[PDB]
Amino acid sequence: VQEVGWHDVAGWLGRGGSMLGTKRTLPKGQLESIVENIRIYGIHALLVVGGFEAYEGVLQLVEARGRYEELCIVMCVIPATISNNVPGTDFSLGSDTAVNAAMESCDRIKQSASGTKRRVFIVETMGGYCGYLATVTGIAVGADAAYVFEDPFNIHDLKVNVEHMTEKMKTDIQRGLVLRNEKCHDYYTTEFLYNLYSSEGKGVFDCRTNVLGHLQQGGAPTP
């Protein structure tokens, strides 16, 4: 714990990531150390800027108020995560940056055929089980499909989408793009969809794959 001043945060606006360290560890395991440090430093309020782990940890401290008197302090959670998976808000802080980075990657990928070859790209986005990032990114890029956990899909839906893509690909449009959330399906992975689209699209289109890993993460924040 370090007391901070006005100028200690100077120029923190445009810096992505976290000047302060981030850890995912929830407070329940080391709760005795947390209450001790709160007592030592006289912390009367707590402003937790973070993702679902921030919200869950603050929930754990609230439920542990009954055991520890010191945890009866005002707490506030600022939802800050790429996935936009934090309950209580519509836009987690930094989801917009991730969406912008994801579409820029998808726009570059969709431009990589350059109007000659007709090709479908399976782009895999992050976000855990939360599909928000995939779906909005699919809207922004005109993706044909955005497979997400919240909309469970089976092989019948996949055949419908693949036939739809094949029919579209015979028309004037030549660059297809289907997004897949990393945890949308247990078995129909990105490799599965690559095999499916490339097999069924034989003689019509080629298929390629690009797993956007931390390309959606480390960018500077959008305005």
Ligand X SMILES: Nc1ncnc2c1ncn2[C@@H]1O[C@H](COP(=O)(O)OP(=O)(O)OP(=O)(O)O)[C@@H](O)[C@H]1O
Ligand Y SMILES: O=P(O)(O)OC[C@H]1O[C@](O)(COP(=O)(O)O)[C@@H](O)[C@@H]1O
* Piece in contact with ligand X (CB under 6 A), picked from 5-13, 33-41, 115-123, 166-174: 5-13
Window 141-180: contact mask with ligand Y (x via CB under 6 A)? ----------------------------------------
Q: Cα separation of 201 and 119, whole Å?
A: 9
Is 141 in contact with 80 (CB distance < 8 Å)?
A: no
Cβ neighbours for 214, distance < 8 A, ≥ 6 positions apart: none
Window 162-201: contact mask with ligand X (x via CB under 6 A)? ----------------------------------------
User: If you write DSSP's letter for every residue of 169-199 in order, what string do you get?
Assistant: HHSS--EEEEEEETTS-SSS-HHHHHHHHHH
Q: Of 1, 3, 4, 11, which lies in the binding site for ligand X, with binding defined by CB under 6 A? A: 11
| Per-residue tokens: 22 | 């981030």
Give the C-alpha distances (Å, rounded to integers) separating 178 from 54, 99, 121.
32, 15, 6
User: Does 85 count as an annotated binding residue?
Assistant: yes
- 13 contact choice in ligand Y, ligand X, a second copy, none (CB below 5 to 8 Å, kind-dependent): ligand X
**Residue 187 interacts with a second copy (CB under 8 A): yes or no:** yes
- 204 contact choice in a second copy, ligand X, ligand Y, none (CB below 5 to 8 Å, kind-dependent): none
Q: What's the angle, vertex CA 53, arms to CA 89 and CA 182, rounded to 5?
A: 80
Is 157 in contact with 101 (CB distance < 8 Å)?
A: no
Q: Pick the closer one to ligand X by CB: 10 or 45.
A: 10
**Residue 217 interacts with a second copy (CB under 8 A): yes or no:** yes
User: Does 119 count as an annotated binding residue?
Assistant: yes
Cβ neighbours for 204, distance < 8 A, ≥ 6 positions apart: 118, 166, 169, 170
Annotated binding site: 24, 81-85, 119, 126-128, 182, 208, 214-217
Annotated binding site for beta-D-fructose 2,6-bisphosphate: 24, 81-85, 119, 126-128, 182, 208, 214-217
Which residues would be at the binding site for ligand X (CB under 6 A)?
10-11, 13-15, 220
